[PDB]
Design an enzyme around this catalytic site. Sequence first.
Site, PDB file in Angstrom:
ATOM      1  CG  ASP A  75      -2.605   2.581   6.207  1.00 36.87           C
ATOM      2  OD1 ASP A  75      -3.593   3.170   6.968  1.00 36.87           O
ATOM      3  OD2 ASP A  75      -1.848   1.624   6.745  1.00 36.87           O
TER       4      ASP A  75
ATOM      5  CB  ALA B 263      -1.895  11.046  17.742  1.00 40.61           C
TER       6      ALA B 263
ATOM      7  CG  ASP C 177       1.720   2.950   5.004  1.00 42.63           C
ATOM      8  OD1 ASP C 177       0.830   2.483   5.538  1.00 42.63           O
ATOM      9  OD2 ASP C 177       2.665   2.210   4.708  1.00 42.63           O
TER      10      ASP C 177
ATOM     11  CG  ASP D 279      -0.380   0.161   2.471  1.00 39.37           C
ATOM     12  OD1 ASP D 279       0.689   0.448   2.492  1.00 39.37           O
ATOM     13  OD2 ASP D 279      -0.879  -0.283   3.578  1.00 39.37           O
TER      14      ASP D 279
HETATM   15  N1  LIG Z   1       0.068   7.144  15.998  1.00 37.67           N
HETATM   16  C1  LIG Z   1      -0.613   6.373  16.740  1.00 37.67           C
HETATM   17  C2  LIG Z   1      -1.034   5.198  16.158  1.00 37.67           C
HETATM   18  O1  LIG Z   1       0.351   4.390  15.863  1.00 37.67           O
HETATM   19  C3  LIG Z   1       0.119   3.026  15.131  1.00 37.67           C
HETATM   20  O2  LIG Z   1      -0.761   3.041  13.982  1.00 37.67           O
HETATM   21  C4  LIG Z   1       0.019   2.767  12.911  1.00 37.67           C
HETATM   22  C5  LIG Z   1      -0.873   1.688  12.465  1.00 37.67           C
HETATM   23  O3  LIG Z   1      -0.655   0.387  12.818  1.00 37.67           O
HETATM   24  C6  LIG Z   1      -0.441   1.756  10.692  1.00 37.67           C
HETATM   25  O4  LIG Z   1      -1.225   0.557   9.990  1.00 37.67           O
HETATM   26  C7  LIG Z   1      -0.805  -0.590  10.092  1.00 37.67           C
HETATM   27  O5  LIG Z   1      -1.489  -1.526  10.778  1.00 37.67           O
HETATM   28  C8  LIG Z   1      -2.711  -1.628  10.110  1.00 37.67           C
HETATM   29  C9  LIG Z   1      -3.553  -2.388  10.891  1.00 37.67           C
HETATM   30  O6  LIG Z   1      -3.949  -2.027  12.253  1.00 37.67           O
HETATM   31  C10 LIG Z   1      -2.627  -2.312   8.885  1.00 37.67           C
HETATM   32  O7  LIG Z   1      -3.805  -2.146   8.012  1.00 37.67           O
HETATM   33  C11 LIG Z   1      -1.764  -1.227   7.971  1.00 37.67           C
HETATM   34  N2  LIG Z   1      -1.612  -1.513   6.706  1.00 37.67           N
HETATM   35  C12 LIG Z   1      -0.394  -1.061   8.817  1.00 37.67           C
HETATM   36  O8  LIG Z   1       0.403  -0.258   7.958  1.00 37.67           O
HETATM   37  C13 LIG Z   1      -0.749   3.223  10.000  1.00 37.67           C
HETATM   38  N3  LIG Z   1      -0.206   3.086   8.524  1.00 37.67           N
HETATM   39  C14 LIG Z   1       0.278   4.151  10.840  1.00 37.67           C
HETATM   40  C15 LIG Z   1      -0.063   4.155  12.179  1.00 37.67           C
HETATM   41  N4  LIG Z   1       0.828   5.091  12.910  1.00 37.67           N
HETATM   42  C16 LIG Z   1      -0.546   2.012  16.398  1.00 37.67           C
HETATM   43  N5  LIG Z   1      -0.672   0.721  15.786  1.00 37.67           N
HETATM   44  C17 LIG Z   1      -1.664   2.838  16.819  1.00 37.67           C
HETATM   45  C18 LIG Z   1      -1.770   4.153  17.360  1.00 37.67           C
HETATM   46  O9  LIG Z   1      -2.956   4.570  17.560  1.00 37.67           O
HETATM   47  N1  LIG Z   2      -1.400  -5.508  12.905  1.00 37.59           N
HETATM   48  C1  LIG Z   2      -0.536  -4.389  13.027  1.00 37.59           C
HETATM   49  N2  LIG Z   2      -0.590  -3.676  14.182  1.00 37.59           N
HETATM   50  C2  LIG Z   2       0.217  -2.761  14.612  1.00 37.59           C
HETATM   51  N3  LIG Z   2       1.160  -2.112  13.860  1.00 37.59           N
HETATM   52  C3  LIG Z   2       1.200  -3.003  12.468  1.00 37.59           C
HETATM   53  C4  LIG Z   2       0.369  -4.104  12.036  1.00 37.59           C
HETATM   54  N4  LIG Z   2       0.794  -4.521  10.919  1.00 37.59           N
HETATM   55  C5  LIG Z   2       1.610  -3.504  10.460  1.00 37.59           C
HETATM   56  N5  LIG Z   2       1.977  -2.734  11.124  1.00 37.59           N
HETATM   57  C6  LIG Z   2       3.043  -1.698  11.169  1.00 37.59           C
HETATM   58  O1  LIG Z   2       2.638  -0.791  10.306  1.00 37.59           O
HETATM   59  C7  LIG Z   2       4.134  -0.213   9.543  1.00 37.59           C
HETATM   60  C8  LIG Z   2       3.927  -0.702   8.038  1.00 37.59           C
HETATM   61  O2  LIG Z   2       2.765  -1.160   7.889  1.00 37.59           O
HETATM   62  P1  LIG Z   2       2.348  -1.874   6.694  1.00 37.59           P
HETATM   63  O3  LIG Z   2       1.753  -0.862   5.541  1.00 37.59           O
HETATM   64  O4  LIG Z   2       1.013  -2.930   6.800  1.00 37.59           O
HETATM   65  C9  LIG Z   2       3.807  -2.744   5.937  1.00 37.59           C
HETATM   66  P2  LIG Z   2       4.914  -1.566   5.165  1.00 37.59           P
HETATM   67  O5  LIG Z   2       6.220  -1.439   5.982  1.00 37.59           O
HETATM   68  O6  LIG Z   2       4.436  -0.176   4.844  1.00 37.59           O
HETATM   69  O7  LIG Z   2       5.351  -2.180   3.739  1.00 37.59           O
HETATM   70  P3  LIG Z   2       4.746  -2.134   2.352  1.00 37.59           P
HETATM   71  O8  LIG Z   2       5.296  -1.043   1.882  1.00 37.59           O
HETATM   72  O9  LIG Z   2       4.470  -3.481   1.731  1.00 37.59           O
HETATM   73  O10 LIG Z   2       3.142  -2.004   2.847  1.00 37.59           O
HETATM   74  C10 LIG Z   2       5.157  -0.727  10.319  1.00 37.59           C
HETATM   75  O11 LIG Z   2       5.550  -0.003  11.624  1.00 37.59           O
HETATM   76  C11 LIG Z   2       4.289  -2.093  11.043  1.00 37.59           C
HETATM   77  O12 LIG Z   2       5.134  -2.748  12.150  1.00 37.59           O
HETATM   78 MN   LIG Z   3      -0.385   0.459   5.576  1.00 36.28          MN
HETATM   79 MN   LIG Z   4       2.694   0.234   3.727  1.00 37.95          MN
END
Ligand SMILES: NC[C@H]1O[C@H](O[C@H]2[C@H](O)[C@@H](O[C@H]3O[C@H](CO)[C@@H](O)[C@H](N)[C@H]3O)[C@H](N)C[C@@H]2N)[C@H](N)C[C@@H]1O
Ligand SMILES: Nc1ncnc2c1ncn2[C@@H]1O[C@H](COP(=O)(O)CP(=O)(O)OP(=O)(O)O)[C@@H](O)[C@H]1O
Ligand SMILES: [Mn+2]
Ligand SMILES: [Mn+2]
Length: 176
Positions: free
Chosen positions: A85, A99, A45, A43
């Site tokens: 995302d 945040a 982000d 994806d």
């Molecule tokens: N800033 C505070 C937040 O930080 C993190 O979120 C992070 C999410 O975990 C990230 O999402 C990731 O985890 C989600 C699922 O939770 C996936 O669907 C997604 N592809 C993956 O990138 C997302 N792209 C960025 C986000 N900062 C914590 N997991 C949750 C917290 O509230």
């Molecule tokens: N289930 C989950 N819960 C919390 N954080 C998650 C998570 N799945 C992924 N992350 C976190 O989200 C960040 C990246 O998320 P993802 O978009 O799903 C993979 P990526 O590093 O961006 O590779 P990609 O370029 O193939 O998407 C990393 O910090 C990873 O640890």
């Molecule tokens: Mn993502």
């Molecule tokens: Mn990603």
Amino acid sequence: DTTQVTLIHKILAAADERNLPLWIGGGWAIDARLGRVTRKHDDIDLTFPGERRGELEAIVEMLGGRVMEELDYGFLAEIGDELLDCEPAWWADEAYEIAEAPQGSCPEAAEGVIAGRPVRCNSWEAIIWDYFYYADEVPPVDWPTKHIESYRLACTSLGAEKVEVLRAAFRSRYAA
Ligand SMILES: NC[C@H]1O[C@H](O[C@H]2[C@H](O)[C@@H](O[C@H]3O[C@H](CO)[C@@H](O)[C@H](N)[C@H]3O)[C@H](N)C[C@@H]2N)[C@H](N)C[C@@H]1O
Ligand SMILES: Nc1ncnc2c1ncn2[C@@H]1O[C@H](COP(=O)(O)CP(=O)(O)OP(=O)(O)O)[C@@H](O)[C@H]1O
Ligand SMILES: [Mn+2]
Ligand SMILES: [Mn+2]
């Protein structure tokens, strides 16, 4: 692929026109800060000014996409077959901040490059911080190799010692 790279260009071109800052996060942010594509990305982000969410949504819709789903931390959008995302950042004194993330998460300066063009991207600390949340749900030893290698790459770029101090700060913040 070229579709994602071209889409990133189109999104940022449209955002530039509105003076809407957008920060590349996650895997593309790593590749941007390195100035090198390291693998296929599932994806894109994005971090966006929370109070200007409508402007990012309008760009998505202008590009033929739609918002797909609300998430606990932001929202999910789709442009064609490509997933966006998206997480808000909020104005904090003199910069936007994600945040709970380390200060400097959303630098004003473009510190990465994608296909030769400077792009704004989240800080190394912010990128690594999200792996700490992940580690708390899933032990690192149980991560797919994708995530292990991305983590290690980000870690090596910032510096292992800086990462272990950052991890101690994370543990302190969320200790119970
Ligand atoms: N800033 C505070 C937040 O930080 C993190 O979120 C992070 C999410 O975990 C990230 O999402 C990731 O985890 C989600 C699922 O939770 C996936 O669907 C997604 N592809 C993956 O990138 C997302 N792209 C960025 C986000 N900062 C914590 N997991 C949750 C917290 O509230
Ligand atoms: N289930 C989950 N819960 C919390 N954080 C998650 C998570 N799945 C992924 N992350 C976190 O989200 C960040 C990246 O998320 P993802 O978009 O799903 C993979 P990526 O590093 O961006 O590779 P990609 O370029 O193939 O998407 C990393 O910090 C990873 O640890
Ligand atoms: Mn993502
Ligand atoms: Mn990603």
